[PDB]
Assembly symmetry: C2
Homo-oligomer: 490 residues x 2
């Protein structure tokens, strides 16, 4: 049945348009391919199945996004008429009412969600990622338990990270490449497609630069000479992962945190409100949620949109499972580390990962022609990374969520002194922009009102609650995950 070993893995692992729609034969992969090869699919099967509860709620958070802001309209009106104000000292009879309508359309996607919708799903997903950490740990105690029964100097690396983390203008060059590849100055779909193009300019060159680090890490680990060939690869991954970590996520880390930070431009209100790209592209909306919304979409989708044994010598060799491990944990850190801005990040992984099983199943049958049946153990070298990413999960998204949806639910608690918490708690969408542009550019300029001097002290009050949210978050969610670590495996 060596032919039927191919055929049952040809036919039942054929489809590559969508689901197989028969079953998911993870056992058949372990019947043939091997416990190294099978525990990649067993994980990616379990990862696909556990994205289904996550993706449905991402639709419900879309539905609680879409319906509860179209029906009662509490955060379109307050959010379109926020951005109707954000250019009122830009007008002065020169290019008056342009980017507001662009800004009023960004707020339909961004400010659809902020305070209930982003936050409740993130606390869910960080618990879910810890649950998925726990459920896979029980699945390790069910699949590897089933598998164990069937078995019967280093400153050069820190130099290269300063190189690789110094490779950020390379993103800004690609952010400038699409600024001249098409160069439109419009508001309907210009900024949507130009930032779509630059991510595509990134993903082409980053994958070219992803192959650079492999030739960097292989010669560098051969220079260090570890004696054991097992820990040689273990040093090789942790070298090359951290290279590919800081290759792949540093565009996002730039645009989540550092692209918005570190900038305060002088010339108060008359010159603060205008001077971004000469008043035409986007001082209507800075809104860095969308640049994280648009990037992870193209980062999630275009893994697809780019891609008797005498003939077996004519083809590329096997053992590409350590990039394959890596290729999905780059996507696991897209889901879990960054689910605050857009919550359908499971489904853009889910629609992806349905093909990505069958894309990689077909890549292991009709390509990469040596199914060795290696059957080694211990995927845990990435599970150590995954928990560490999961430890970074409750840190990083708490540093994502507590800089976007904590402007407003404390500005409930300044201007609503008399009457409300929620109902006229939507009135403090706008006046936070009348305060100004809520970042470091925006809590500073009320000194021409009162006579950066004193009003940049209300910046600290949010920055208190910014830091107070995280210290509540990574303590509760590490305590909520202290529940889930004990409930499941017994």
């Amino acid at each position: 049945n060596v032919e039927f070993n191919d055929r049952k893995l040809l036919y039942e692992e054929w489809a590559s348009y969508g689901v197989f729609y028969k079953y998911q034969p993870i056992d058949l992969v372990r019947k043939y391919f091997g416990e190294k090869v099978g525990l990649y699919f067993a994980w990616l099967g379990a990862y696909t199945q556990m994205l289904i509860p996550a993706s449905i709620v991402g639709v419900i958070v879309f539905l609680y996004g879409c319906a509860t802001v179209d029906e009662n309209i509490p955060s379109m009106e307050m959010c379109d008429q926020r951005y109707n104000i954000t250019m009122c000292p830009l007008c002065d009879k020169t290019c008056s009412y342009w980017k507001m309508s662009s800004a009023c359309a960004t707020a339909r996607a961004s400010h659809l969600f902020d305070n209930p919708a982003t936050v409740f799903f993130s606390v869910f997903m960080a618990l879910w990622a810890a649950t998925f950490m726990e459920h896979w740990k029980r699945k390790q105690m069910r699949l590897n338990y089933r598998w164990d029964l069937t078995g019967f100097i280093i400153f050069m690396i820190a130099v290269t990270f300063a190189i690789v983390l110094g490779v950020i203008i390379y993103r800004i060059s690609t952010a400038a490449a699409l600024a001249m590849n098409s160069s439109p100055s419009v508001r309907s779909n210009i900024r949507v497609t130009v930032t779509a193009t630059a991510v595509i300019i990134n993903l082409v060159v980053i994958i070219l630069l992803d192959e650079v680090y492999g030739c960097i890490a292989r010669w560098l680990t051969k220079i260090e000479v570890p004696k054991t060939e097992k820990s040689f690869e273990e040093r090789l991954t942790f070298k090359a992962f951290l290279l590919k970590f800081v290759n792949s996520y540093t565009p996002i880390f730039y645009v989540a945190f550092f692209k918005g930070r570190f900038v305060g431009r002088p010339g108060d209100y008359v010159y603060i409100f205008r001077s971004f790209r000469m008043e035409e592209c986007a001082p209507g909306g800075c809104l860095m949620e969308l640049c994280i919304q648009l990037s992870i979409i193209m980062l999630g989708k275009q893994l697809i949109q780019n891609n008797r044994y005498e003939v077996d010598f004519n083809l590329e060799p096997f053992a590409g499972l350590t990039p394959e491990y890596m290729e999905m944990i780059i996507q696991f850190g897209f889901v879990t580390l960054f689910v605050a801005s857009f919550p359908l990040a499971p489904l853009f992984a889910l629609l992806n990962n349905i093909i990505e099983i069958r894309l990689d199943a077909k890549k292991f049958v009709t390509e990469l022609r040596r199914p060795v049946a290696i059957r080694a153990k211990d995927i845990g070298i990435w599970y150590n990374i995954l928990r560490g990413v999961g430890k970074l999960a409750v840190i990083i998204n708490a540093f994502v969520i507590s800089f976007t949806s904590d402007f407003i639910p404390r500005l409930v608690y300044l201007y609503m002194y008399s009457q409300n918490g929620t109902m006229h708690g939507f009135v403090n969408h706008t006046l936070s922009s009348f305060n100004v542009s809520d970042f470091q550019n925006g809590t500073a300029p009320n000194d021409p009102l009162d006579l950066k001097y004193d009003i940049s002290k209300d910046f600290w009050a949010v920055l208190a609650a910014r830091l107070a949210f995280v210290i509540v978050f990574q303590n509760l969610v590490m305590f909520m995950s202290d529940f889930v670590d004990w409930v499941i495996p017994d």
Copy 2:
């Protein structure tokens, strides 16, 4: 050798004045007493031995405290002449210069340390406690590994915690009991001994109330009826521990955090500076470090200062090892959870624990007359608590250390604009008290200078860095402990 079983544990475990000075025969305890009984002494042996590196540095932090503030005198002068100012609107020819000299003596102990001495040892000890968590884990993998080879409704509880955490005026009554048991109004040694007395009034009654919770927890767990008698005791500890946790540490949790918080008294500078206990006891120094210094001393020391078998029926029974487990983890949480104010908390545990081996060794030979040789396994039901206390360690002392020694190393970075970071960085001891009384009573009253309104916004700036220190702390020290969790057991 049944007599010699007694005699070798009589004679080699006799001394009870200090060290045995022969050896520490942990094996002989496991040769006779049992792996339940022995792994208490094996832990308390390892806990005593690992306090020796901690206690020496506590002397060095005392030496870096004592010498570097007596020789160069940079934080006596700046700290005595801080407190020479803190009553200058109290004087007004009525009880002028009294409590300054009391305050100038509190600052010799408190402000001996703050910014280098407390902080460097805490980061050391929180790493050390994680190291001691790791070293005992390797000792578990060496002692229990040696031992495993030789082996061949619940709302009623949450009601009672609201009772027990509601039992805090009981501390304040004992804080008022010593206020009338002697009632002096002096400054040399009145506040030192009155607060020494009230802790003694606590430790008498708390131990009386510690026995109350056992009769509470035993009937309450018998009311819940767990079927398995093993998990019956496991529910019993976690009921009674959390009772004795909130019995014992809630005086400290009160005086660390909540006794200083939640109080802002109106009537600015003329009435703010004076109105604590009518200007005679201690508006010279509030200084809640000492109340945590003095309490843990009496909490650490006075475990001592209060305390052919026909005759065996005339004595109290065995199986008091679950309070004995508890009695030391109350002391482990004295060391690790609270080492920021006074750093010799290892040595006041160390001098204690040298006797506390021989006190409890003699209590198991000449008293409690049944050494059953039970030899059961798994101390880990408290190791789960201990890591949880150790997880609370990096939280709580970061909430201890970042409210005392973060007044000043950011007030380096207000008034030293021109010339210094450290040398005239001692000049901002005083002006923080000229700001006022650095807590919530103290960042508020500059509104009669400028015309609570606006100057309570520099409170947030510290409260930023208060929260910013913790979020640096419990992330770095959980990353520094990510090193130590991998270095030792391989």
